[PDB]
């Protein structure tokens, strides 16, 4: 598996607006919220749990990076994998996506897989 | 062994001016480069290999304190142990020293083993 | 091995302009795009994987050092050992080089293994 | 479990006012007291112990966030769980509820469980 | 053991002024020098060796927090335990106390155990 497979989606030119940490199924979980940084779009929620999916070896590196982009409020390209989490009380509250990467987008072009 | 032994030298009122990280023999390290307060004396490179010396346990604690002082750029005092790592080309690049301690220096007097 | 072998390379007066954290083969990776400090040259990319190459024991030391040299945006020297990772999609998307150290350029010249 | 069930409880629009880390029974712990940003209501105190509760694994994640939201001063929706501790004197000084989560409340909505 | 025991002492309105990360007997340590925020009293030192005393597990948590209050410069109330360290040249250098906790301080009262 790879962050930039053809099966992964990505939303370029996004800014992280709202963070949230907790714990589910005895595993910690963070979560971020993104809105378009250039006028309008659709807000997308996506976040990963520490011991659930195949992206678990990256929870520590992504949480340190998602808190780095939430801190400066810059434009980023987020790679996600839709329809990962299945907990209804939590899927309907946050999302069903799973964060799998965090690129850094320049003025008009981003830096990462496409 | 102690950071404030008699076999260890120290230089007061130094300023961490350059931070170089890397890896030699499957072990990370970092060789800071510190200059004096008013640009006097000579620069003092002091490496710290992760798993090669007897000062290995404090490699992580000395890295975070040598980065916090390289960023804020304030007075420090480093303790080293000379004549280590007989490797020829390594010493010619940085030094024959090993970072052993890092004390925070005030305006008049520092805070550590004199 | 060592960062400053005779089989390595070095790009003084570069700037870490972007940063992408992800994961490949259950192993978090991070890449950095280095543009020249005066906008000239070509974008030089050099990734780093946590448990793939022989430079794996220094992943967390290079991830935290790039993420700090990317914030300050200052000039550095990136050491690369080319022809390491052979994943074709990874190569044409990011690079074929390999981050094996990160020095700190100065007003006169860079400190580190030439 | 999760930080957003009816068996839990929260106090929205709050702001982390104080933070205390120590050690109880060979285990670290941290606690926060939450007061509004307009001079209203009664402060709400939460706690979390490293290995003496069911909120043990997320101790390091919550400490990273409770120390981040404490520095940004933004309005935080802070969740708790009532009557989880048992030490009689420990409750008489800080609290009896747990610290389970830390959202990022906005002026209109609240990105968190409710 | 606890942080708010009557056996353990406490000093209020303490501003952390110095910091020193070294290594003794194959274990790192750190010592802080807290000073009154008014100019009265005496500066008290409270070291914390990695694995030597009963306050061993909270070395990492009290080192991250001692660096926070030392940077922001906010007044806190520290709690210590006297007559702990016994190495001759170590006690004569900093102190014989052991840092057990770190409570934040408001304008009127402190958020600590009394």
């Amino acid at each position: 598996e790879w962050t930039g497979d053809n099966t992964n989606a990505y939303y370029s030119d996004e800014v992280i607006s709202e963070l949230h940490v907790g714990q589910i199924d005895t595993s910690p979980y963070f979560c971020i919220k993104t809105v378009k940084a250039n006028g309008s779009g659709t807000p997308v929620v996506a976040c990963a749990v520490s011991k659930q999916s195949i992206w678990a070896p990256s929870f520590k590196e992504l949480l340190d990076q998602a808190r780095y982009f939430y801190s400066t409020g810059q434009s980023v390209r987020i790679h996600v994998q839709k329809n990962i989490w299945t907990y209804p009380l939590f899927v309907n509250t946050f999302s069903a996506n799973a964060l799998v990467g965090l690129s850094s987008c320049s003025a008009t072009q981003c830096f990462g897989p496409k | 062994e102690w950071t404030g032994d008699n076999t260890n030298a120290y230089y007061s009122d130094e300023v961490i001016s350059e931070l170089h990280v890397g890896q030699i023999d499957t072990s990370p390290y970092f060789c800071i480069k510190t200059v004096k307060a008013n640009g006097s004396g000579t620069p003092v490179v002091a490496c710290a290999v992760s798993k090669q010396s007897i000062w290995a346990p404090s490699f992580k604690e000395l890295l975070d304190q040598a980065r916090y002082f390289y960023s804020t750029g304030q007075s420090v005092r480093i303790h080293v142990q000379k004549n280590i790592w007989t490797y020829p080309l390594f010493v010619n690049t940085f030094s024959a020293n090993a970072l052993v301690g890092l004390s925070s220096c005030s305006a008049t007097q520092c805070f550590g083993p004199k | 091995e060592w960062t400053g072998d005779n089989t390595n390379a070095y790009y003084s007066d570069e700037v870490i302009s972007e940063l992408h954290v992800g994961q490949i083969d259950t192993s978090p990776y991070f890449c950095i795009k280095t543009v020249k400090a005066n906008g000239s040259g070509t974008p030089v990319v050099a990734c780093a994987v946590s448990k793939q190459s022989i430079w794996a024991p220094s992943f967390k030391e290079l991830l935290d050092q790039a993420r700090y040299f990317y914030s300050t945006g200052q000039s550095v020297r990136i050491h690369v050992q080319k022809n390491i990772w052979t994943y074709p999609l990874f190569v044409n998307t990011f690079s074929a080089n390999a981050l094996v150290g990160l020095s700190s350029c100065s007003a006169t010249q860079c400190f580190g293994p030439k | 479990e999760w930080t957003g069930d009816n068996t839990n409880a929260y106090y929205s629009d709050e702001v982390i006012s104080e933070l205390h880390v120590g050690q109880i029974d060979t285990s670290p712990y941290f606690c926060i007291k939450t007061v509004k940003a307009n001079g209203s209501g009664t402060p709400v105190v939460a706690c979390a112990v490293s290995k003496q509760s069911i909120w043990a694994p997320s101790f390091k994640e919550l400490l990273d966030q409770a120390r981040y939201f404490y520095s940004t001063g933004q309005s935080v929706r802070i969740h708790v769980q009532k009557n989880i501790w048992t030490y009689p004197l420990f409750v008489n000084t800080f609290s009896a509820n747990a610290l389970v989560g830390l959202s990022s409340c906005s002026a209109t909505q609240c990105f968190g469980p409710k | 053991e606890w942080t708010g025991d009557n056996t353990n002492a406490y000093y209020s309105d303490e501003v952390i002024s110095e910091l020193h990360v070294g290594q003794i007997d194959t274990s790192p340590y750190f010592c802080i020098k807290t000073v009154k925020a008014n100019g009265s009293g005496t500066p008290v030192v409270a070291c914390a060796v990695s694995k030597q005393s009963i306050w061993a597990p909270s070395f990492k948590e009290l080192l991250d927090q001692a660096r926070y209050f030392y940077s922001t410069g906010q007044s806190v109330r520290i709690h210590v335990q006297k007559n702990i360290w016994t190495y001759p040249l170590f006690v004569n250098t900093f102190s014989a106390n052991a840092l057990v906790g770190l409570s934040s301080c408001s304008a009127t009262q402190c958020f600590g155990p009394k």
């Binding site: 340190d64 808190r67 780095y68 801190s71 400066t72 | 975070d64 980065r67 916090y68 960023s71 804020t72 | 993420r67 700090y68 914030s71 300050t72 945006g73 | 990273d64 120390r67 981040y68 520095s71 | 991250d64 660096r67 926070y68 940077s71």
Partner: peptide, 14 residues
């Protein structure tokens, strides 16, 4: 001129 807020949160964190 770089934003000091991420650079400050970088050295204080962890």
């Amino acid at each position: 001129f770089y934003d000091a807020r991420p650079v400050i949160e970088l050295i204080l964190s962890k």
